[PDB]
Short mmCIF file of all heavy atoms in Angstrom, two decimals:
data_model
loop_
_atom_site.label_atom_id
_atom_site.label_comp_id
_atom_site.label_asym_id
_atom_site.label_seq_id
_atom_site.Cartn_x
_atom_site.Cartn_y
_atom_site.Cartn_z
N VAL A 29 0.82 -1.21 0.00
CA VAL A 29 0.01 0.00 0.01
C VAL A 29 0.87 1.27 0.00
O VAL A 29 0.61 2.21 -0.71
CB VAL A 29 -0.97 -0.03 1.20
CG1 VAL A 29 -0.21 0.21 2.51
CG2 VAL A 29 -2.05 1.08 1.01
N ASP A 30 1.95 1.22 0.78
CA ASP A 30 2.89 2.33 0.87
C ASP A 30 3.85 2.38 -0.30
O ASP A 30 4.13 3.42 -0.89
CB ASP A 30 3.72 2.23 2.17
CG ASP A 30 2.98 2.78 3.38
OD1 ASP A 30 1.82 3.16 3.26
OD2 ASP A 30 3.65 2.83 4.46
N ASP A 31 4.43 1.21 -0.66
CA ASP A 31 5.38 1.16 -1.73
C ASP A 31 4.78 1.49 -3.10
O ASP A 31 5.42 2.14 -3.92
CB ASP A 31 6.03 -0.24 -1.78
CG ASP A 31 7.38 -0.21 -2.46
OD1 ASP A 31 8.30 0.44 -1.89
OD2 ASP A 31 7.53 -0.79 -3.56
N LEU A 32 3.55 1.05 -3.34
CA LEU A 32 2.91 1.33 -4.61
C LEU A 32 2.58 2.82 -4.67
O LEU A 32 2.59 3.44 -5.71
CB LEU A 32 1.68 0.46 -4.80
CG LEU A 32 0.92 0.55 -6.16
CD1 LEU A 32 1.91 0.48 -7.33
CD2 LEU A 32 -0.08 -0.59 -6.22
N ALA A 33 2.24 3.37 -3.47
CA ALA A 33 1.92 4.79 -3.42
C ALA A 33 3.18 5.60 -3.81
O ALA A 33 3.09 6.54 -4.55
CB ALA A 33 1.52 5.15 -1.96
N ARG A 34 4.34 5.15 -3.31
CA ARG A 34 5.59 5.82 -3.60
C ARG A 34 5.86 5.74 -5.15
O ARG A 34 6.32 6.72 -5.74
CB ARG A 34 6.74 5.18 -2.81
CG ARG A 34 6.75 5.56 -1.36
CD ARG A 34 8.10 5.18 -0.71
NE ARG A 34 8.23 3.71 -0.52
CZ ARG A 34 7.71 3.04 0.49
NH1 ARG A 34 6.96 3.66 1.40
NH2 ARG A 34 7.89 1.71 0.57
N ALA A 35 5.55 4.59 -5.73
CA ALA A 35 5.78 4.36 -7.15
C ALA A 35 4.93 5.31 -7.99
O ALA A 35 5.39 5.92 -8.97
CB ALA A 35 5.51 2.93 -7.53
N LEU A 36 3.65 5.47 -7.60
CA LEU A 36 2.74 6.35 -8.31
C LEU A 36 3.26 7.78 -8.40
O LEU A 36 3.06 8.48 -9.38
CB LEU A 36 1.36 6.32 -7.68
CG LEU A 36 0.51 5.05 -7.91
CD1 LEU A 36 -0.71 5.04 -7.05
CD2 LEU A 36 0.16 4.97 -9.40
N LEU A 37 3.92 8.24 -7.29
CA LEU A 37 4.46 9.58 -7.27
C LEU A 37 5.51 9.79 -8.36
O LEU A 37 5.76 10.91 -8.78
CB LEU A 37 5.06 9.86 -5.89
CG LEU A 37 4.05 10.03 -4.75
CD1 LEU A 37 4.76 10.04 -3.44
CD2 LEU A 37 3.27 11.33 -5.00
N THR A 38 6.15 8.73 -8.81
CA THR A 38 7.18 8.83 -9.85
C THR A 38 6.63 8.84 -11.26
O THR A 38 7.36 9.19 -12.19
CB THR A 38 8.22 7.68 -9.77
OG1 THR A 38 7.62 6.46 -10.23
CG2 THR A 38 8.70 7.47 -8.33
N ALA A 39 5.36 8.48 -11.41
CA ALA A 39 4.76 8.39 -12.75
C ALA A 39 4.46 9.75 -13.39
O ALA A 39 4.79 9.94 -14.56
CB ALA A 39 3.47 7.57 -12.68
N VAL A 40 3.84 10.64 -12.66
CA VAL A 40 3.51 11.96 -13.18
C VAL A 40 3.67 13.02 -12.06
O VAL A 40 3.08 12.90 -11.01
CB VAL A 40 2.02 12.03 -13.69
CG1 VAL A 40 1.69 13.45 -14.14
CG2 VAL A 40 1.82 11.04 -14.83
N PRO A 41 4.46 14.07 -12.31
CA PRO A 41 4.58 15.07 -11.24
C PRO A 41 3.26 15.77 -11.01
O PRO A 41 2.53 16.08 -11.95
CB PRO A 41 5.67 15.99 -11.76
CG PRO A 41 5.99 15.70 -13.18
CD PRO A 41 5.38 14.36 -13.41
N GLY A 42 2.94 15.99 -9.74
CA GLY A 42 1.69 16.66 -9.41
C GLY A 42 0.50 15.73 -9.21
O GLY A 42 -0.59 16.15 -8.81
N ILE A 43 0.71 14.42 -9.49
CA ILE A 43 -0.34 13.46 -9.31
C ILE A 43 -0.90 13.50 -7.88
O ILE A 43 -0.14 13.56 -6.92
CB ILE A 43 0.16 12.04 -9.64
CG1 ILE A 43 -0.98 11.03 -9.69
CG2 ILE A 43 1.25 11.61 -8.64
CD1 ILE A 43 -0.60 9.67 -10.26
N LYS A 44 -2.22 13.50 -7.75
CA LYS A 44 -2.90 13.51 -6.47
C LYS A 44 -3.71 12.23 -6.40
O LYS A 44 -4.48 11.93 -7.30
CB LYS A 44 -3.79 14.71 -6.32
CG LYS A 44 -3.01 16.06 -6.28
CD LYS A 44 -2.05 16.07 -5.13
CE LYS A 44 -1.23 17.37 -5.12
NZ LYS A 44 -0.21 17.40 -4.04
N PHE A 45 -3.56 11.46 -5.33
CA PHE A 45 -4.28 10.22 -5.27
C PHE A 45 -4.47 9.61 -3.87
O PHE A 45 -3.89 10.06 -2.84
CB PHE A 45 -3.54 9.15 -6.10
CG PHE A 45 -2.21 8.79 -5.50
CD1 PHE A 45 -2.09 7.68 -4.66
CD2 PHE A 45 -1.08 9.56 -5.73
CE1 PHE A 45 -0.89 7.36 -4.06
CE2 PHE A 45 0.16 9.24 -5.14
CZ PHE A 45 0.24 8.16 -4.29
N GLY A 46 -5.28 8.59 -3.83
CA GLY A 46 -5.54 7.82 -2.63
C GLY A 46 -5.45 6.37 -3.05
O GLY A 46 -5.89 6.03 -4.13
N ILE A 47 -4.81 5.54 -2.20
CA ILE A 47 -4.72 4.12 -2.51
C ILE A 47 -5.08 3.34 -1.26
O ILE A 47 -4.67 3.70 -0.15
CB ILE A 47 -3.34 3.73 -3.01
CG1 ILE A 47 -3.30 2.21 -3.34
CG2 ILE A 47 -2.23 4.06 -2.00
CD1 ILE A 47 -1.99 1.73 -3.91
N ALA A 48 -5.88 2.31 -1.44
CA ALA A 48 -6.28 1.46 -0.28
C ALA A 48 -6.09 0.00 -0.73
O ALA A 48 -6.31 -0.35 -1.89
CB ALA A 48 -7.72 1.72 0.07
N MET A 49 -5.72 -0.84 0.21
CA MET A 49 -5.53 -2.27 -0.10
C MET A 49 -5.94 -3.13 1.10
O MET A 49 -5.65 -2.80 2.21
CB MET A 49 -4.03 -2.45 -0.40
CG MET A 49 -3.66 -3.82 -0.92
SD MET A 49 -2.05 -3.85 -1.70
CE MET A 49 -1.92 -5.60 -2.02
N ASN A 50 -6.65 -4.19 0.76
CA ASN A 50 -7.16 -5.13 1.80
C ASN A 50 -6.21 -6.18 2.31
O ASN A 50 -5.58 -6.89 1.52
CB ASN A 50 -8.43 -5.76 1.31
CG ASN A 50 -9.51 -4.74 0.96
OD1 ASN A 50 -9.59 -3.69 1.61
ND2 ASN A 50 -10.33 -5.01 -0.06
N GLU A 51 -6.09 -6.30 3.62
CA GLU A 51 -5.21 -7.28 4.24
C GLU A 51 -6.14 -8.31 4.91
O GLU A 51 -6.90 -8.01 5.81
CB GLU A 51 -4.32 -6.63 5.28
CG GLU A 51 -3.36 -7.58 5.95
CD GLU A 51 -2.54 -6.93 7.03
OE1 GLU A 51 -2.90 -5.84 7.47
OE2 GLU A 51 -1.49 -7.49 7.43
N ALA A 52 -6.04 -9.54 4.41
CA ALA A 52 -6.87 -10.67 4.88
C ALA A 52 -6.81 -11.03 6.35
O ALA A 52 -7.83 -10.98 7.04
CB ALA A 52 -6.59 -11.89 4.02
N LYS A 53 -5.62 -11.47 6.83
CA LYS A 53 -5.48 -11.89 8.22
C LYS A 53 -6.19 -11.04 9.26
O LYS A 53 -7.00 -11.52 10.02
CB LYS A 53 -4.01 -11.94 8.55
CG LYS A 53 -3.24 -13.06 7.81
CD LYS A 53 -3.79 -14.44 8.09
CE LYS A 53 -3.09 -15.50 7.24
NZ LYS A 53 -3.61 -16.87 7.51
N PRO A 54 -5.93 -9.70 9.30
CA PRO A 54 -6.60 -8.86 10.26
C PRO A 54 -7.90 -8.26 9.74
O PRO A 54 -8.61 -7.50 10.43
CB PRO A 54 -5.57 -7.77 10.53
CG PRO A 54 -5.01 -7.54 9.17
CD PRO A 54 -4.82 -8.98 8.64
N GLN A 55 -8.20 -8.59 8.48
CA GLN A 55 -9.44 -8.11 7.79
C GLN A 55 -9.50 -6.56 7.92
O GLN A 55 -10.49 -6.01 8.30
CB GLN A 55 -10.66 -8.74 8.43
CG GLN A 55 -10.68 -10.24 8.25
CD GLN A 55 -11.92 -10.90 8.89
OE1 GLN A 55 -11.85 -11.34 10.03
NE2 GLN A 55 -13.00 -10.95 8.17
N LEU A 56 -8.37 -5.92 7.50
CA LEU A 56 -8.26 -4.50 7.55
C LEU A 56 -8.00 -3.88 6.19
O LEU A 56 -7.22 -4.46 5.38
CB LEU A 56 -7.14 -4.08 8.49
CG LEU A 56 -7.33 -4.17 10.00
CD1 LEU A 56 -6.01 -3.85 10.69
CD2 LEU A 56 -8.43 -3.17 10.43
N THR A 57 -8.52 -2.70 5.97
CA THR A 57 -8.31 -2.01 4.71
C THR A 57 -7.27 -0.95 5.04
O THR A 57 -7.48 -0.03 5.83
CB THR A 57 -9.58 -1.31 4.18
OG1 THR A 57 -10.56 -2.31 3.76
CG2 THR A 57 -9.25 -0.36 3.03
N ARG A 58 -6.08 -1.10 4.44
CA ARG A 58 -4.95 -0.18 4.65
C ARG A 58 -5.07 0.90 3.59
O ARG A 58 -5.64 0.66 2.51
CB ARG A 58 -3.63 -0.90 4.51
CG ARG A 58 -3.52 -2.16 5.33
CD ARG A 58 -3.55 -1.88 6.83
NE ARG A 58 -3.16 -3.02 7.67
CZ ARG A 58 -2.78 -2.96 8.91
NH1 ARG A 58 -2.76 -1.75 9.51
NH2 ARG A 58 -2.42 -4.03 9.55
N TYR A 59 -4.49 2.09 3.87
CA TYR A 59 -4.54 3.15 2.89
C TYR A 59 -3.46 4.28 3.10
O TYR A 59 -2.93 4.50 4.19
CB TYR A 59 -5.94 3.79 2.93
CG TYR A 59 -6.13 4.64 4.12
CD1 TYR A 59 -5.83 6.01 4.04
CD2 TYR A 59 -6.67 4.11 5.31
CE1 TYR A 59 -6.09 6.84 5.15
CE2 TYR A 59 -6.92 4.93 6.39
CZ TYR A 59 -6.63 6.28 6.31
OH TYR A 59 -6.78 7.09 7.43
N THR A 60 -3.14 4.93 1.97
CA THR A 60 -2.33 6.16 1.99
C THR A 60 -2.41 6.87 0.62
O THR A 60 -3.34 6.70 -0.15
CB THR A 60 -0.88 5.79 2.29
OG1 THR A 60 -0.12 6.97 2.32
CG2 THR A 60 -0.33 4.87 1.20
N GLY A 61 -1.61 7.84 0.55
CA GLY A 61 -1.69 8.65 -0.65
C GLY A 61 -1.24 10.05 -0.29
O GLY A 61 -0.49 10.23 0.67
N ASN A 62 -1.64 11.05 -1.07
CA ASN A 62 -1.25 12.43 -0.80
C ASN A 62 -2.41 13.40 -0.96
O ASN A 62 -2.25 14.57 -1.25
CB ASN A 62 -0.08 12.81 -1.72
CG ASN A 62 -0.51 12.85 -3.18
OD1 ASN A 62 -1.64 12.52 -3.54
ND2 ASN A 62 0.41 13.28 -4.06
N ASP A 63 -3.62 12.89 -0.75
CA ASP A 63 -4.84 13.67 -0.84
C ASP A 63 -5.89 13.09 0.13
O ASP A 63 -6.36 11.99 -0.09
CB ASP A 63 -5.41 13.67 -2.26
CG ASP A 63 -6.58 14.57 -2.44
OD1 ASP A 63 -6.37 15.80 -2.48
OD2 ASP A 63 -7.71 14.07 -2.54
N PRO A 64 -6.28 13.86 1.16
CA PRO A 64 -7.26 13.45 2.12
C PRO A 64 -8.55 12.91 1.57
O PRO A 64 -8.97 11.76 1.89
CB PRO A 64 -7.51 14.72 2.96
CG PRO A 64 -6.15 15.39 2.92
CD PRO A 64 -5.78 15.23 1.44
N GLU A 65 -9.18 13.61 0.64
CA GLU A 65 -10.43 13.22 0.05
C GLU A 65 -10.32 11.89 -0.75
O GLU A 65 -11.09 10.95 -0.50
CB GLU A 65 -10.95 14.33 -0.88
CG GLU A 65 -12.29 13.99 -1.55
CD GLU A 65 -12.79 15.12 -2.42
OE1 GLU A 65 -12.93 16.25 -1.88
OE2 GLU A 65 -13.05 14.89 -3.62
N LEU A 66 -9.39 11.80 -1.66
CA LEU A 66 -9.22 10.58 -2.46
C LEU A 66 -8.82 9.39 -1.58
O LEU A 66 -9.16 8.27 -1.88
CB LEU A 66 -8.20 10.82 -3.56
CG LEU A 66 -8.58 11.89 -4.57
CD1 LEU A 66 -7.50 12.09 -5.61
CD2 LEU A 66 -9.93 11.50 -5.22
N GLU A 67 -8.08 9.67 -0.48
CA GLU A 67 -7.71 8.58 0.44
C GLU A 67 -8.92 8.03 1.13
O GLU A 67 -9.12 6.82 1.24
CB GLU A 67 -6.73 9.12 1.44
CG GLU A 67 -5.33 9.34 0.91
CD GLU A 67 -4.36 9.92 1.96
OE1 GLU A 67 -4.39 9.46 3.11
OE2 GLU A 67 -3.61 10.87 1.60
N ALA A 68 -9.81 8.92 1.62
CA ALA A 68 -11.02 8.50 2.31
C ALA A 68 -11.90 7.67 1.34
O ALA A 68 -12.43 6.61 1.71
CB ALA A 68 -11.78 9.70 2.82
N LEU A 69 -12.03 8.17 0.10
CA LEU A 69 -12.84 7.47 -0.91
C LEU A 69 -12.26 6.13 -1.34
O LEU A 69 -13.00 5.18 -1.56
CB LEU A 69 -13.05 8.37 -2.12
CG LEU A 69 -14.10 9.47 -2.02
CD1 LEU A 69 -14.15 10.29 -3.26
CD2 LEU A 69 -15.46 8.78 -1.81
N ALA A 70 -10.92 6.09 -1.46
CA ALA A 70 -10.25 4.84 -1.87
C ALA A 70 -10.52 3.79 -0.81
O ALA A 70 -10.79 2.62 -1.13
CB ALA A 70 -8.78 5.08 -2.08
N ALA A 71 -10.37 4.16 0.45
CA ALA A 71 -10.56 3.22 1.55
C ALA A 71 -12.03 2.77 1.63
O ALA A 71 -12.31 1.58 1.89
CB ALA A 71 -10.14 3.88 2.88
N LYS A 72 -12.97 3.72 1.44
CA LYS A 72 -14.37 3.37 1.48
C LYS A 72 -14.76 2.34 0.44
O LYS A 72 -15.45 1.38 0.68
CB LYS A 72 -15.19 4.63 1.30
CG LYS A 72 -16.69 4.40 1.43
CD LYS A 72 -17.46 5.75 1.26
CE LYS A 72 -18.99 5.56 1.46
NZ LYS A 72 -19.74 6.82 1.28
#
């Protein structure tokens, strides 16, 4: 979730995004990015 977020930053300068990814064991949705709104929406 964190590493792919870092990779996206290298694709296009100025890119704004939210990324969320599901982890089975703890049944948790992890998330990050560089935009509050898109992060909340990605996780939802």
Side-chain angles (χ1 to χ4, degrees):
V29 69
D30 278 5
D31 204 66
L32 185 46
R34 287 192 287 278
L36 287 170
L37 289 169
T38 72
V40 176
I43 188 169
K44 294 300 178 182
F45 69 93
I47 180 176
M49 188 164 174
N50 302 326
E51 182 183 17
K53 295 298 177 181
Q55 297 178 266
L56 286 173
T57 291
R58 308 295 192 163
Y59 75 92
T60 181
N62 65 356
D63 186 73
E65 182 178 303
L66 298 179
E67 284 177 44
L69 280 177
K72 183 178 183 180

